Amino acid sequence: STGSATTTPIDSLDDAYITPVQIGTPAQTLNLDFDTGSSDLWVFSSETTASEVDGQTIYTPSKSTTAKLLSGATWSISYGDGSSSSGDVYTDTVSVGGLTVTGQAVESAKKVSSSFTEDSTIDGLLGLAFSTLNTVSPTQQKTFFDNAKASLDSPVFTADLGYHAPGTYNFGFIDTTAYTGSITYTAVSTKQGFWEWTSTGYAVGSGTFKSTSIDGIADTGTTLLYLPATVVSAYWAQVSGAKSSSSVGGYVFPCSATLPSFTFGVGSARIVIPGDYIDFGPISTGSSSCFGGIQSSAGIGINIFGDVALKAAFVVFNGATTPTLGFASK
Ligand SMILES: NCc1ccc(C(F)(F)F)cc1
């Protein structure tokens, strides 16, 4: 079997992407943020504290004939920004773009952090990292992808994120019309539960390629590109007037500047991020200072190839027994 679903940016900056997901019987459609950096499927629900819900569509297990309470199971997650949520667990039928999994763990939020409440367009997260990171206790649960793996034609999913435009998540097949050239595959380490890989180097604009190993994770759930301080300094040094700002929390640049492209290596292949993808607009309404899409990972502890990088490529998440990541130009 296969599935295919359109994913849509939530705002004009591509801060995140939402994908419609059908939960329950009859279907309740929620717009979820597909996150290859986490492994929980959690949703706003009828159980969420009413004061913490502002315009989200909620999952109502009592209206689903296939929902079953997973007795005694709880979950609690905290993300890399101090985002957190927690609650109890149901099992229910979950379908993505025609692909159906029965008995999927659906984690119902009783409390969510304020950053989720203020984001009316995201009804929950669908985690696509490895199941070892799932937070359900005492019995850890499988991700949607792990549950679907057996039924899939091929144990893969692909991410084709658009620049200021809709894109596609496909499950079980590789659309050979969606990319150009060849797909370059690279080894994945699962030791931390992430889609972790090693980039072979980088270039700034038309500069010479610097061969150097950058270990990082492919994370559709993170907006920006977070790289070591040395790399990020070399990039912003080519932008007249750019500086690292303590009060803003990262590199900013004059909105009038034109940004150079950024190239990262995948084996012997090169993926080019156009400079326009790195512009995240004014730091505040009316400001002439703009926020950069490439930032330092020094405070995070891990390098993150977020949406800024991934949307420049067609990306294959190969969940075979030896997992690999594939990158192609598009
Ligand atoms: N998109 C989920 C996510 C968020 C933050 C982190 C890290 F890097 F902070 F641990 C990993 C994964």
Q: Determined by which method?
A: X-ray
Nearest to 232 by CA among 266, 278, 269: 278
Q: Label each residue of the chain as H, E or C.
A: CCEEEEEEECCCCCCCEEEEEEECCCCEEEEEEEECCCCCEEECECCCCHHHCCCCCCECHHHCCCCEEEEEEEEEEECCCCCEEEEEEEEEEEEECCEEEEEEEEEEEEEECHHHHCCCCCCEEEECCCHHHCCCECCCCCCHHHHHCCCCCCCEEEEECCCCCCEEEEECCCCCCCCEEEEEEEECECCCCCCEEEEEEEEECCCCCEEEEEEEEECCCCCCEEECHHHHHHHHCCCCCCEEECCCCEEEEECCCCCCCEEEEECCEEEEECHHHHEEEECCCCCCEEEECEEECCCCCCEEECHHHHCCCEEEEECCCCCEEEEEEC
Q: Which atom of ligand 1 is nearest to the CA of 226?
A: 8
Resolution (A): 1.8
Q: How far apart are CA 168 and CA 159, in angstroms?
A: 6
Distance from residue 306's CA to the centre of ligand 1 (Å): 10
Query: Which residues pair with residue 126 across a beta bridge?
Result: 34, 41
Q: How far apart are CA 259 and CA 273, in angstroms?
A: 11
Q: Which two tokens stand for residue 227?
A: 């790289």
Q: Which amino acid is at 299?
A: G
Q: How far apart are CA 163 and CA 178, in angstroms?
A: 14
Q: Which atom of ligand 1 is nearest to the CA of 221?
A: 1
Instruction: Determine contact, residues 33/221, Cβ cutoff 8 Å.
Output: yes
Q: Which two tokens stand for residue 184?
A: 């370059």
Q: Ligand 1 test: best mutation among 126, 128, 304, most atoms within 8 Å of CB?
A: 304
Ligand 1 interacting residues, C-beta cut-off 6 A: 35, 37-38, 79-80, 219, 221-222, 300, 302, 304
Residue 324 φ then ψ, to 5°? -140, 160
The domain segmentation of the chain, as residue ranges, is 5-174, 175-330
User: What positions carry a catalytic annotation?
Assistant: 35, 199
Nearest to 228 by CA among 256, 255, 199, 249: 199
The rounded radius of gyration (Å) of the Cα atoms in the chain is 20
